[PDB]
Design a protein around this ligand. Structure first.
Ligand SMILES: [Ca+2]
Ligand SMILES: [Ca+2]
Ligand SMILES: [Ca+2]
Ligand SMILES: [Ca+2]
Ligand SMILES: [Mn+2]
Ligand SMILES: [Mn+2]
Ligand SMILES: [Mn+2]
Ligand SMILES: [Mn+2]
Lengths: 237, 237, 237, 237
C-alpha cells in the first residue's frame, strides 16, 4: 500500500499499541509502532520547532524537537532509506484527533533535498519554504480536513470558528512536486526538514499528534486513520 | 490565451517580424516581437550560460548570456510583472526549429523565487536545480518533442539517434510545481533563473532559438508555433 | 579618506544639513547629505526589518524598511558602485546618539554577496547570518561603544544597565572578512543585506539613527561623528 | 599546540607510520596516524571532488572522494567534535611534497557551517564559495608556499613556471574569518565542506597529499611538516 516513513510528534500515549506512558517523538518505519522513541516534554499552547535530518552516508534518520527556553528532545534511528522508499516520493505533514483533541497548526515549513553526483560540480536540489500560507496555496495538496489561510497558517485538523479543536479529524498537507530521493549517479544524498507547530488544547489530555512524513507519490489518507493512527497508517500493526 | 513573458535566445533573424539582422537575445512581453533586443555573438557548438533576473523593487527584467572566454550580451527592460502575469504561474524552457535546424540541449537549469513579507523573519521561497536529467524526470512537464535522459540532458527539440537536429520541431519543459510570484503581504519579491545550453547545427544558419518563459499554470504549445514563434506564441502579432 | 556608501535609517531631521522634516531612510554616497530620501513612518519601541539590494546589471541601490502590520518605506538610487567603491570592501552597521538618544539594537543581521563569472558553473559567494550574538563574537569587529551579548543582541550605542540609552554615543560592527565586490571575469555581481533592529527611546524625539554601510577595508569611526553624522562621516559636507 | 582535525587525501603510503599499502583517504584526529582509513583509487592528472560532512546529532565525520566516471571512496569516524575542538576555529586546506612530488592544485572550495538555536527561527550560518582564485585573495590566509592566481587556481605547494611540482614544499590556505562551531543555545550544529582538486605528477609515485583541516584560530605550519606530515603535524606520533 502506501510506503510510509514518518517522524511522529505523538501527544497521546496509547500503551496498548506500544506508545510509552508519556508524550514523545518517534521514528516510524511502515508502522505506527515506532521503531525508536524519546520522551518529549510537550508544552500545550507553545510554538515549537522540529528538525528532521538524514544523509545517505551516515544512514541515520534523526529528529530534534524543542521549544524556546526549554531543553530539546532527540531521537535517532539507523535506516538505509533506499531500502524502504521508492525512487520518487512526496513529502508532507499529517495530524489527527480522536476522542481527545488539539489544534495541529503549522506556522512555517521548509524542506531541502540534495543529490550530489560523482560528476564535477553536479548537484540536484529542491528547496521549499513556507513562512506563511494563503487561502489558495496551489503548490500544496490538502487531504482530509486540512486548510490554509486562517491568519496565514496551515490547520491540519478541524478547528471551529471560535478556535476550538474538533475530535475525529484527520488532515495532511503534501508538497505539490514529487521529490527525487535516489539517483544512480549520486555519491551523497540528503534531506532536511523543519517546521514550527502549535499544539493547543483546552483539555489536560491532548491527542493525537503531528507527523512529518515521506510517502509514495500517490499517497492518500487511509480509512479510519483518525486518532492514534495519525492519518498515516490503516491499522495498528 | 496563454500569458507569456519570455527571454528569447533567438538564433535566426526573421526581419519581417521585427528581428534585427543578426542572432540576438530579447525580452518578449506577450509577443514574439521583442520589446527590447541586444546583439548576441552566438557560438555554434559551444556551451553557453544565460542569467535572467528580476525584483519587484527595481521592476526590471534583465538577462545576461555569455560563453567561456567571450564577452557577454546583456538586455534589460523595465516591466512591472505584477501588471502582466497572474498570481500563480509556471516556469519553463522552450525551443523550436523551422526550415533551418539546431540542437536545443539543456545541460543544467536552476530557478529561485523569493517573496519577503513585512513580517519579522517571514520569507517564502522555491528553488530547484537540475545539473542532470533522468529518463523519468517526474518533476518536469514535457510538452511536444522534448525529452530527457540522453546522456543526462534535456533535448527540447528532436535530435535523431545519429546526433542530427530535426526541423519543424517544438518542445517545452516546465517545472511541475506552480510558482507564487505575487503575495499581498510581500514587500520584496524576486526570482533568478540560470541555464547552460548547447546550440549546435551542421549548417551555417541555425534556427530558431531557445527561450526561458513564465506563463499561466495551464500553458501548452500553441498550434504551429514551430520555427520563428519558438513554441511560445500562436502568431506573429 | 574612508570611501563610504550607506543606507541610513535617520530618526532625527537635521534640516540645516539637508534632512527633510521627518524620520526617513536615505541613500548616502560619500556624504551624510543623502543623494535620495523617502519618508519613514518610524515606530518607537517596535522591531523593524530593513532590506538593502543591489546588482551590477540594473545598477540601482534600493532599500525597503518595514514594521509588522504597517506599510513599507522604499528608496532607490541609480549608482554604479564599481565607480565608487574599491575592489575589496568591508560591510557593517553604524549608529549614534547626539543631544537626543535612542537604543540602536540589532537582533539579526545577514548579508550575501555573489559574483558570477563568464565561465561554466563559476560563482563566488559569501553569506553570513547572525540570528543571535555572543559576548565574544570573534567574527565581528566592534568599534566605539558597540557591544554584543546583552540577551544575544548587538547594542551599537551605549545602553545603561537599567536599559536607558546614552547620548553622544557612536559604535559600529563590521564583519571580520573583507568582501570582494568586483571581479574582472564577473558578468553579474550582486549583494543582499537584511537586519532586524529595535529603535527605542523614552523621549518623543529619538536620535540619531542606524546605518548599514560598505567601506574600504581599514575603516574606523571618524572623529566627532556622534549625533547627526551617524559615525560614518567626519563632517557635514 | 595546534588542535588539528583533518581529512587527508594521502597519495603516498608511509607504512612505518601506519599508512596502509596504497593511496587512501583518512580521518586524522590530532595525529597523522589516521583513526580510520579507506582505500582510494587515485587518478593522476584527473580533477577530483571531495565531500566532508558532519552534524552534532549523529556525531560522525564522513568524507566522500570521487572522480568522474569512477566509483567513490568513503570513510567515516564517530567523533564528538565538541570534545576535540575549541569553540572558535579556522578551516583550511593543506598539502606537501617530500622526496616525491605532485601538484596540489585547488580549483574550487566551498564551506558551510550552521548552528540552529532552540529559539523560533534562529539560525546562525557562514558560507563561502570559491570557484576561482585571484592573485590578491584578501579573504584567504596563505601559509608556506601556497599561492593563488595562476590561471585562477590555488597552488598549495610550489609549482615551477614550466608546470613541474617541487619537492619539500608545504603550503596551507585558511579562510580569513574564524568559524563558530559550538554555541551554548544550539540544538543542532553542522558543517559541509567541498573542493575540487587536481593531483598531478610526472612520476609513478606521487606524494604526499592534500588535507582539509579545522584548527585553532592561530594555527600555522609546524616545523619540518613537509612530506608525510602534510603540513599539519609536527611529528609522527
Ligand atoms: Ca498516540
Ligand atoms: Ca527568429
Ligand atoms: Ca539626522
Ligand atoms: Ca603518506
Ligand atoms: Mn507513538
Ligand atoms: Mn527575435
Ligand atoms: Mn538623513
Ligand atoms: Mn595516511
Amino acid at each position: 500500500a502506501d510506503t510510509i516513513v514518518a517522524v511522529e510528534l505523538d501527544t497521546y500515549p496509547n500503551t496498548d499499541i506500544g506508545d510509552p506512558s508519556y508524550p514523545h517523538i518517534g521514528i516510524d518505519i511502515k508502522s505506527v509502532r515506532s521503531k525508536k522513541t524519546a520522551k518529549w516534554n510537550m508544552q500545550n499552547g507553545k510554538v515549537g520547532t522540529a528538525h528532521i535530518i538524514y544523509n545517505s552516508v551516515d544512514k541515520r534518520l534523526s529528529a530534534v524537537v524543542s521549544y524556546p527556553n526549554a531543553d530539546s528532545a532527540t531521537v535517532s534511528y539507523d535506516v538505509d532509506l533506499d531500502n524502504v522508499l521508492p525512487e520518487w516520493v512526496r513529502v508532507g505533514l499529517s495530524a489527527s484527533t480522536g476522542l481527545y483533541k488539539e489544534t495541529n497548526t503549522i506556522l512555517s515549513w521548509s524542506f531541502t533535498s540534495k543529490l550530489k553526483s560523482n560528476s564535477t560540480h553536479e548537484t540536484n536540489a529542491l528547496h521549499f519554504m513556507f513562512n506563511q500560507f494563503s487561502k489558495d496555496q496551489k503548490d500544496l495538496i490538502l487531504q482530509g480536513d486540512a486548510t490554509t489561510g486562517t491568519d496565514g497558517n496551515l490547520e491540519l485538523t478541524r478547528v471551529s470558528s471560535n478556535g476550538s479543536p474538533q475530535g475525529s479529524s484527520v488532515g495532511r498537507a503534501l508538497f505539490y512536486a514529487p521529490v527525487h530521493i535516489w539517483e544512480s549517479s549520486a555519491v551523497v544524498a540528503s534531506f532536511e526538514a523543519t517546521f514550527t507547530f502549535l499544539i493547543k488544547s483546552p483539555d489536560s489530555h491532548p491527542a493525537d499528534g503531528i507527523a512529518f512524513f515521506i510517502s509514495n507519490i500517490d499517497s492518500s489518507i487511509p480509512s479510519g486513520s483518525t486518532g492514534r493512527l495519525l492519518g498515516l497508517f490503516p491499522d495498528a500493526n
